[PDB]
Design a protein around this nucleic acid. Sequence first.
RNA 1: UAAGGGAAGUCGGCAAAAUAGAUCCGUAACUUCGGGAAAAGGAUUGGCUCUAAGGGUUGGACAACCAACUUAGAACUGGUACGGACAGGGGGAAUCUGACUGUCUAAUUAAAACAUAGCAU
RNA 2: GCGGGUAAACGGCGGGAGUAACUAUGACUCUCUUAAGGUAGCCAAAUGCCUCGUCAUCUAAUUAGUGACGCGCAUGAAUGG
RNA 3: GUCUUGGCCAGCCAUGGUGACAACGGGUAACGGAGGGUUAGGGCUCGACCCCGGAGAAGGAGCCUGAGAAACGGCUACUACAUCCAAGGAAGGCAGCAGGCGCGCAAAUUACCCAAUCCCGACACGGGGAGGUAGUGACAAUAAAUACUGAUACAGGGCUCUU
RNA 4: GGUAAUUCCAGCUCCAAUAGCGUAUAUUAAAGUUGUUGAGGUUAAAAAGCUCGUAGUUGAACCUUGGGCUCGGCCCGUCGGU
RNA 5: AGGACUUUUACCGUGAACAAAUCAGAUCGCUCAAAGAAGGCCUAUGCUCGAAUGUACUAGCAUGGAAUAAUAGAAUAGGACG
RNA 6: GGUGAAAUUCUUGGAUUUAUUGAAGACUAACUACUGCGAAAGCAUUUGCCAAGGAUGUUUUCAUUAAUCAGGAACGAAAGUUAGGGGAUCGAAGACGAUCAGAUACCGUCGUAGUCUUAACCAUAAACUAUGCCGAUUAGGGAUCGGACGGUGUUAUUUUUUGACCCGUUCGGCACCUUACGAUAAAUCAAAAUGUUUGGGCUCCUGGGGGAGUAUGGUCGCAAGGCUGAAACUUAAAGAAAUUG
RNA 7: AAAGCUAUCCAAACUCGGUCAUUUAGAGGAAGUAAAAGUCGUAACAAGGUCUCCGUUGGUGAACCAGCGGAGGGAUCAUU
RNA 8: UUUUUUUUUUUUUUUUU
Lengths: 25, 144, 129, 150, 99
Amino acid sequence: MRAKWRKKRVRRLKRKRRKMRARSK
Amino acid sequence: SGGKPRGLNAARKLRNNRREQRWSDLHYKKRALGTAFKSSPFGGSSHAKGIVLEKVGVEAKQPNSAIRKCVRVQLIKNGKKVTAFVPNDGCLNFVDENDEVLLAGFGRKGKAKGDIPGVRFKVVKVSGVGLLALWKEKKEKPRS
Amino acid sequence: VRTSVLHDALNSINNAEKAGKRQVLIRPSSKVIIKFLQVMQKHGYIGEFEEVDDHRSGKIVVQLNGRMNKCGVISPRYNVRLAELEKWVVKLLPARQFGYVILTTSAGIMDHEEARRKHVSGKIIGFFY
Amino acid sequence: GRMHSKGKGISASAIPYSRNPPSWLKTTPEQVVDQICKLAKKGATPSQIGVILRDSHGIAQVKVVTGNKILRILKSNGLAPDLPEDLYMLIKKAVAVRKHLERNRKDKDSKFRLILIESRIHRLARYYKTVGVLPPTWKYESSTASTIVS
Amino acid sequence: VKKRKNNGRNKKGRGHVKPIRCSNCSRCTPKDKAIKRFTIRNMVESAAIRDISDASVFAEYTVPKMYLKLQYCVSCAIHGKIVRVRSREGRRNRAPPPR
RNA sequence: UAAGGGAAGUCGGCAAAAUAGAUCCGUAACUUCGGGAAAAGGAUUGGCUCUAAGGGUUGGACAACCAACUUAGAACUGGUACGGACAGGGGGAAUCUGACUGUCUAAUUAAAACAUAGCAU
RNA sequence: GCGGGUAAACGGCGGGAGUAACUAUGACUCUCUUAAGGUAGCCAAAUGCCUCGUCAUCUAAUUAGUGACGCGCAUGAAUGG
RNA sequence: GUCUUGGCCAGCCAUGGUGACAACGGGUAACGGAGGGUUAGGGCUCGACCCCGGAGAAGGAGCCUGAGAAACGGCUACUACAUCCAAGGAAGGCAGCAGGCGCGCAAAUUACCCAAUCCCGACACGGGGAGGUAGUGACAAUAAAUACUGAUACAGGGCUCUU
RNA sequence: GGUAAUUCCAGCUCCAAUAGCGUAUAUUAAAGUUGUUGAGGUUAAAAAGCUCGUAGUUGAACCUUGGGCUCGGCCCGUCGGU
RNA sequence: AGGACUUUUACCGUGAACAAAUCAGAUCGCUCAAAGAAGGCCUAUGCUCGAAUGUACUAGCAUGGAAUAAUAGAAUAGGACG
RNA sequence: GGUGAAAUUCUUGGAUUUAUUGAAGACUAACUACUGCGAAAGCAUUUGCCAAGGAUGUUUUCAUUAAUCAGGAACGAAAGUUAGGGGAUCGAAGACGAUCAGAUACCGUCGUAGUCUUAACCAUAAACUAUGCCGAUUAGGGAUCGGACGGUGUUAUUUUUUGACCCGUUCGGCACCUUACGAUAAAUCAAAAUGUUUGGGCUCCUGGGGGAGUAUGGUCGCAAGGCUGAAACUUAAAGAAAUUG
RNA sequence: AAAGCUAUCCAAACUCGGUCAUUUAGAGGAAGUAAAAGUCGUAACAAGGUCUCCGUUGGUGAACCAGCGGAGGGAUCAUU
RNA sequence: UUUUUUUUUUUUUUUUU
Ligand SMILES: [Mg+2]
Ligand SMILES: [Mg+2]
Ligand SMILES: [Mg+2]
Ligand SMILES: [Mg+2]
Ligand SMILES: [Mg+2]
Ligand SMILES: [Mg+2]
Ligand SMILES: [Mg+2]
Ligand SMILES: [Mg+2]
Ligand SMILES: [Mg+2]
Ligand SMILES: [Mg+2]
Ligand SMILES: [Mg+2]
Ligand SMILES: [Mg+2]
Ligand SMILES: [Mg+2]
Ligand SMILES: [Mg+2]
Ligand SMILES: [Mg+2]
Ligand SMILES: [Mg+2]
Ligand SMILES: [Mg+2]
Ligand SMILES: [Mg+2]
Ligand SMILES: [Mg+2]
Ligand SMILES: [Mg+2]
Ligand SMILES: [Mg+2]
Ligand SMILES: [Mg+2]
Ligand SMILES: [Mg+2]
Ligand SMILES: [Mg+2]
Ligand SMILES: [Mg+2]
Ligand SMILES: [Mg+2]
Ligand SMILES: [Mg+2]
Ligand SMILES: [Mg+2]
Ligand SMILES: [Mg+2]
Ligand SMILES: [Mg+2]
Ligand SMILES: [Mg+2]
Ligand SMILES: [Mg+2]
Ligand SMILES: [Mg+2]
Ligand SMILES: [Mg+2]
Ligand SMILES: [Mg+2]
Ligand SMILES: [Mg+2]
Ligand SMILES: [Mg+2]
Ligand SMILES: [Mg+2]
């Protein structure tokens, strides 16, 4: 996997993580 | 080399820089943080005792085709669950459900050794009797 | 920015010596440089050195005879005790009978062997062999 | 090199070895100090005084002719400028950039140069306060720069 | 491994150079990196030059020459055989081919 | 107004009780950084005898003649009572909904409805 | 009438079958079909019949409350999410 | 007030004190040291523990006697734990020596004696689980059994000769 | 180790230490793999995108040298005094 | 022994003081050794050597050295000298 | 039109092509280079204004005022954000036509945000010379840019000055060519040399590969995100430069 | 001179909040690692069959694709 | 200058005058 889009996949996953935390908060 | 300071009054910088860079050393970092006391299945001890929960088989890593015989053991001292390898030919018969066994390190410093994946401990004694003694014709398993 | 004119002199000396040149131009001029040169000259590791006078820091032209292996400075100038000369000599020189470690003591710029005679110590500033 | 540029350019003036007035000068040290005082009284800066004396009146080096540099002559005669040359030109330059920067706001290159010009003033004024030329409470302020230069 | 001393272009000391478009790809490539050919050939082919001279009226007319500057990217020049892969030692020879 | 219990009553804490002034302390999540906030939660408060500070005018860090309130400190005192009547917030953790202020079915519905700024056509 | 544009115009936004080395599910495939087949989001929500849905929490006990799940009878983007 | 100095405390006055040269705060599976292990030099690491200093006697606080204690094989009170009882009451502190439970991978006899080292007492005389002796004891360390030898027969390496 | 196993299970033989040997964990040397002595930074990990700048660290040359008069101790030789 | 006149710091030399035990290390045939501080000699009468020595980084105390590294000095002379 | 070939698409309402003119917005070709300026990012039509800069020359002035910098601050491509203006071309997303087993792609026709500008953010790039800043020394050579100096002869002007060209010296730059007394593991390097014969000054970063530039806490941002930044666990290799196939 | 009693002081202890530090349960969600003869594609290594890679933005079962700007670690050290 | 997807696990070498 390209590191450019491994970074994009993780960055997308981080954005979803923050939404799940805002939901609980 | 490096651009380290070379003044006569730069001991503070030299000591501070060494203290910062010493954390990258894996073995000093392990000791300084005290990870053995924190995260290790043992409390930093050489051995530990536990109760055999079940017998499991572990497939050997390539290139090797065998079923390594192991047991799921719950440590008495802290309740953590680990997997322990049972060495020697046919020694899994001696171990049974709800037995009291003693575990030790398996190789070098908590890393799995050999073609056994994810197993980092070994069984030493069962019911207060050495596994080698049981495996040889030396001692008898307790009547219980 | 010039920080060690002594290092500049010895580096220029060593560069010309390795290139096989029989002379070298040294800038600038300092009391330490002249005294350090005279220590060379007493043991014969160099030849004539001539200082050119000017209305500023002077220049020195050193004639090299080719019997000079390595000359270097020590930074910083560590404070050396009498018991520490042997460790300094062992760790820094070749076999302990050819080279000479240069110190600065209350008696002036002078050798490590001379320190053992006069029973004095000070700060290491250079070496040669 | 330059303190605020890559600028590794060597260019200076080489003072001759003589330290002695040349035989073709027939001027008295009293006369040249009178020339120095007259020029300084008019308003000439000590840097400017040396240029006009050297170019027109044949004084190669005032120190060689007399024995004292121009500024020490001016202080002895009580005509030294209140503000040193070095700060006055640096502060005047900074004031010039401000009037350009007030009108032109998109000039981010001029903004960067002003920081360099200001940084030299602070480093310089720090040195003068150390030796005692300026009062220890002297401070260079952005809006008060024009007042000092006037 | 660094394949070439000049990387692949000529901009040492230039910072940034505006790009251009490849002649037959439209690829956006820097002007100094691109491979440029200046071609000067007769506007009529040599085979048909004689017939044009026949129709000359007005028989002293000289056929004009087309003046083209072709700019290529690396992929197009190599595929178009404008430039070819050279040996490790032969890569450093910066001389135009002789005539 | 009620002993003990304290919502077990009831569709539902409806009704009532509780808190309440001033001074000092302390104040969370969250946040549009403006708020939340009087968050939450504590301590003091009477009378009497004093002391101190905070000004003006006329004559040269002073002297004399006036002035009415506010604040602070200390003894003493009492069946430990003191915003002694009057007057005078209950609070917190969340969910749904409307952003808020505002408006309407005079005489059963004041609301989540209407309006609003903002956005768009 | 014919032809083109227009959805912050009114509005609309699909079925069936097979398939992964325990089983289960179906990333994948085939087919019918539409103007398009509901995207980002959200949910037994004032919108979910079955329904007192299933799991967890709250209580001694909860058809109530809250947090999750989602083939959602019949959620959903200025008919604004 | 104390044996005495001291913001140690009570009154009055002033706004100072520390910090990037790391103050303040947090962690320590941290009692400090003499020292143990291992290193050419420079170092790394450990130090509960036979010695010196500190602190504690289930957890805090208070106090009497006394030259000397905030004492605990002294007292008083509270919390936890726990013993006897006629139920009204009484009594307790093994991190002293043995021993038991628990905990754990992990550590000994409910023995003999003041004879030796010293301490204490009114004291030559008595007491001392300080201390010594013995038992368990593969912590570690030192020395050191499990075998010695003659001939006969055979083989090899030599020796004078290779008949 | 997949039907000729010098590696498993055994029999024989041999090797190392030997009243000891093995194993697990902690630490030290090896480790110039923490580098003050004494590491590395183009491509193996690593020069901040660039500049200014405080604390810190470091910072051009220059002031009594030269000569002589001597006196004594010790060391390197032959004189050796007993 | 009383006073006056000494630029001040860093650095080096020397000296005093600096628990035992440990460590290095001297001596003695505990049958050798680990250990221990004993012992040895005379037939005796009683006679005697020992139980050494080194180790105190850094901080503190006293003195000497004056190179090296810093800091002051007379400039609006408010300077030195009887 | 367009392509390997086509098709979607436009067209007797005259498409495409021809000539003239107008409007709009963007951009500044050829000149253009182993050339220049800028701290870097970057900077290419003319003219005027505003402020700045390096090199050069100096027998001007001050006299150590300096170097590098933890935190701290200014600038910082493209993309992206907020509010207006503009919106020609190109063109994420989207819709079709092909190809293909599929084609949510490469190819072709459209086409929104964007691309342009003012005000305010964002602070990241293979932001690269993958090579920190200051200083000294060390092999030769020729080009080239800016300045200065000396000489020579043509050319234009000239009350004999200046410009262009020629030769040489020197300072300061962008680089380059051969070599190794050296360096490196090697490729290669005039610095990556002057280092086991190891010390000129300063700052920053790294300690086998993953997990991971992730989780968490803090802080900055309207948001996207930026800066700081682990551990559990897992593994005997991952990796660099060359060699023969 | 005992019990008792007045007023300060030292202050255990408990209750009620606050803060710090360290452990620990949790439906469900989203990752990582390992184990191999699982399904689907073939993104990268050759010009890997659309050169590869970086920053940013958007989209798609998945590897990935596309727009803008950049780099060569390129498949060009070069065209007079 | 039309396109060309994939290849199940392990197994592939030692000494001296
Ligand atoms: Mg120094
Ligand atoms: Mg293997
Ligand atoms: Mg220079
Ligand atoms: Mg600087
Ligand atoms: Mg500054
Ligand atoms: Mg760039
Ligand atoms: Mg009821
Ligand atoms: Mg009504
Ligand atoms: Mg009503
Ligand atoms: Mg409404
Ligand atoms: Mg609806
Ligand atoms: Mg402790
Ligand atoms: Mg302990
Ligand atoms: Mg007591
Ligand atoms: Mg006991
Ligand atoms: Mg290394
Ligand atoms: Mg790489
Ligand atoms: Mg790298
Ligand atoms: Mg850089
Ligand atoms: Mg300094
Ligand atoms: Mg037409
Ligand atoms: Mg140019
Ligand atoms: Mg142009
Ligand atoms: Mg200029
Ligand atoms: Mg970066
Ligand atoms: Mg980089
Ligand atoms: Mg240099
Ligand atoms: Mg040049
Ligand atoms: Mg020139
Ligand atoms: Mg240049
Ligand atoms: Mg490491
Ligand atoms: Mg690592
Ligand atoms: Mg390779
Ligand atoms: Mg490629
Ligand atoms: Mg390559
Ligand atoms: Mg294949
Ligand atoms: Mg497949
Ligand atoms: Mg496959």
